[PDB]
Paper text:
To access this source of nutrients, gut bacteria encode α-l-fucosidases (fucosidases) which catalyze the hydrolysis of terminal α-l-fucosidic linkages. We identified and characterized a fucosidase from R. gnavus E1 with the capacity to recognize fucosylated glycans capped with sialic acid and to hydrolyze α1–3/4 fucosyl linkages in these substrates without the need to remove sialic acid. The enzymatic characterization of R. gnavus fucosidases focused on previously uncharacterized bacterial fucosidases revealed that fucosidase ATCC_03833 belongs to [name]-A while E1_10125 belongs to [name]-B subfamily.
In an attempt to obtain crystal structures in complex with the substrate, an active site mutant (E1_10125 [name]) was generated. Clear electron density was present for both α- and β-fucose anomers. Following 500 ns MD simulations of the E1_10125 [name] mutant and docking of the sLeX ligand, the molecular model showed that sialic acid ring sits in the neighboring subsite. Polar contacts are established between nearby residues, Glu262 and Trp269; in particular, and hydroxyl groups present at sialic acid C4, C8 and C9 positions. This analysis confirmed that the E1_10125 fucosidase enzyme shows an open binding site able to accommodate the sLeX ligand.
Numbering used by the authors: 7 to 512
Write the structure that this text describes.
Amino acid sequence: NWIGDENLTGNAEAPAKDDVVPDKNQFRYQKEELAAFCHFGPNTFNEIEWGEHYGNQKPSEIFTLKNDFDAETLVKTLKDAGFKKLIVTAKHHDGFCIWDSEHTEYDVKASGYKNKNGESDILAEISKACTDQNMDMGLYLSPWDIHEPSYGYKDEHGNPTTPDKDAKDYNEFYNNQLEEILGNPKYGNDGHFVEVWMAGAKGSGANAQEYDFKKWFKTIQDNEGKAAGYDADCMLFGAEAYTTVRWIGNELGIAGKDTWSKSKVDKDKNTINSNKQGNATVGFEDGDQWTVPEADARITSGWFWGTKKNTPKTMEELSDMYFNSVGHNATLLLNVPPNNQGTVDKAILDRVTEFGNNIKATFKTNLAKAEGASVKVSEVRGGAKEYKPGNMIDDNDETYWATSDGKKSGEILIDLGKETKFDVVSIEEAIQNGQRINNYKVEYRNGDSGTWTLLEEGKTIGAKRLCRTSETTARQIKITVGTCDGKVPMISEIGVYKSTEDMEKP
Ligand SMILES: *O[C@@]1(*)[C@](*)(O*)C(*)(*)(O*)[O@](*)(*)[C]([C])[C@@]1(*)O*
Ligand SMILES: [Ca+2]
Ligand SMILES: [Ca+2]
Ligand SMILES: [Ca+2]
Ligand SMILES: [Cl-]
Ligand SMILES: [Cl-]
Ligand SMILES: [Mg+2]
Ligand SMILES: [Mg+2]
Ligand SMILES: [Mg+2]
């Protein structure tokens, strides 16, 4: 006996939230799904991924951009394709700064680069374009610095020594560059960054350098967090127990099929465990800190553009990436690298646009809301209109279906209203109240009776579960979701889709 939206006159309290919930930045990021990376700097000009070998070459020799950087085309293309954030390499491992920095002469101001307006600040140009399009921003500032003399332990003569005799403290240099960028309103979206990216990667032979994450965290939040009057702390990647955005554990855009947005942290020992299983961090059902699972990936073969690494991935590769990241409760952070002309190759921009168009066309028509279709449930929390099944098809992440206290599992019946072709089932857990679902099942059949065919079963839902199959014909789809004893499931949205040709399962 299936329950619809009609004649619900009951009362219920909201389900208790989980102990561990996303902050407002983490929740917005998980619902944005798509972010863009922008790697740009001397490596763009030198056919290399790690700029380890510049030595004493001048900024003007290694950063040779001769045209005004085209931030407007990049940002417009990304915004039109559905990307909601741009994370910029202000400084890569080479140490070259693409903003005008008073703390170093190893920067774009020293390179001789000037835009149409006589300014020398690529990070400011990108920030202006992002601000104009209301594109949120992240700041990538490499902890490892191959150039900066304060990096490592060196005496007043520049020769290796012990930490007590180190003449210049890299932790102060890095902190000062954080303050210089984050404290200046010409950087960010209207002065604001929502994510700081601290790469953990470092050369095997590089100098030892202990990082003062506590110091840097304070500078970040005093500029971009609750202490600065924002509604959440600025998200941090690569900051030990301060981490609020975790690395998915590979650079291929792949999240584990059952991914939890939670890690185990030790604030005293400054550690984080995100449960590495095979090639991905799958998190913990009982994790004590929300971490957004962030799958960083390259649209080309490298992070930097180059003449031998400018062919963009195919739609087959990018569709697989989408379903294995966004469809597995992870964000996709896709790099789109500018070229040595300060533009983006037309082939790369066209593939970004094609990828965005395919995602939009795939999710345009929710077959759970087509003519004659209906969404019903096995039970409605308190028989209350506040938890009605139509809350799963209202395109409002704040409204959800849930069951009554004592009912840890429920079923959703989607009647498509006729025999219907589909290949994607979409399920979104109301993660503002926690990630708690630990079993799901999706089944389908012809007609309105008889046995069910299994589409998919697994553990997690989280921000988004996409179940992608081969083209299937059905009249009805049944979704089962369950949590542990003493909790109830909360589903904010569901959908059924037929993907575009270039998003179909191979
Ligand atoms: O290069 C590379 C590095 O190493 C890492 O850390 O990250 C990524 C993104 C890139 O940048
Ligand atoms: Ca030093
Ligand atoms: Ca700021
Ligand atoms: Ca809803
Ligand atoms: Cl290389
Ligand atoms: Cl209840
Ligand atoms: Mg949404
Ligand atoms: Mg420009
Ligand atoms: Mg300077």
